Design a protein around this ligand. Sequence first.
Ligand SMILES: CNc1ncc2cc(-c3ccc(-c4cccc(C(F)F)n4)cc3Cl)c(=O)n(C[C@H]3OC[C@H](N)CO3)c2n1
Length: 264
Amino acid sequence: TNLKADPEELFTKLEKIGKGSFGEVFKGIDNRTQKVVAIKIIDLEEAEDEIEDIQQEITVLSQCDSPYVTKYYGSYLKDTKLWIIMEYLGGGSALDLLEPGPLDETQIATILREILKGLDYLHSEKKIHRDIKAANVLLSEHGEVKLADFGVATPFWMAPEVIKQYDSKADIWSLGITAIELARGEPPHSELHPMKVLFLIPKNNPPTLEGNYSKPLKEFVEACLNKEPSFRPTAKELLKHKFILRNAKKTSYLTELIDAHHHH
Ligand SMILES: CNc1ncc2cc(-c3ccc(-c4cccc(C(F)F)n4)cc3Cl)c(=O)n(C[C@H]3OC[C@H](N)CO3)c2n1
């Protein structure tokens, strides 16, 4: 973390793009390159007991070099504020893109395929994302799909073994939930109080994808959502799952989904 440079000279802060973990996030401009960046600003006075988790996510992101993981550019300390600079992805989150209407299975498969490419990278690197969900999947304006908002090392996407206090297979369960979310708009139990979901996930049979979806998609979900982690496939194996192979297409096609969200 750069303690000497002034981030307010280096970056032009623009509009908020939502509330993130531990701080507010803004669209911004790198004044030297004119590239758009995402800027998270954390008040270290207000968020004292969480600084350890902040440095941990900074460390993890700095160790990632993948087309499928949002790029980290650095961080700056100015007075009491920590500025964290990331790649700006103009397509929004996958969750955002659900809003105009349902995804088709080509769009679902393409997004899941790219998520799997990111999980394959992280797991090969002995990393766990820990918070796979549609809101943490970001798209570039060209349709590229990247992971963001790693979980710290809300219950709806959590694997049962995580709740009961796991390895990379936890990400595979969360991917199954995310698959349901991309198909249906929300994860299982989304109508229920989170404290109820905390005991339902360990006690109940795993969720299934309900509705008029293709059997390969239902089987993709079922394969991820096995209570037994060792019975879940790896990200590598799921990249060859028939649902992915028969339905995923070029990521550039997702610009149609991005454009639809702007006309909505
Ligand atoms: C809409 N386009 C877009 N493009 C890029 C980003 C990049 C980030 C982002 C993420 C994480 C960190 C970070 C790094 C280290 C430690 C910590 C943590 F300890 F504090 N955090 C820094 C940044 Cl800058 C971001 O919040 N958003 C908005 C976000 O998208 C996902 C949704 N779940 C909530 O809103 C983005 N949005």
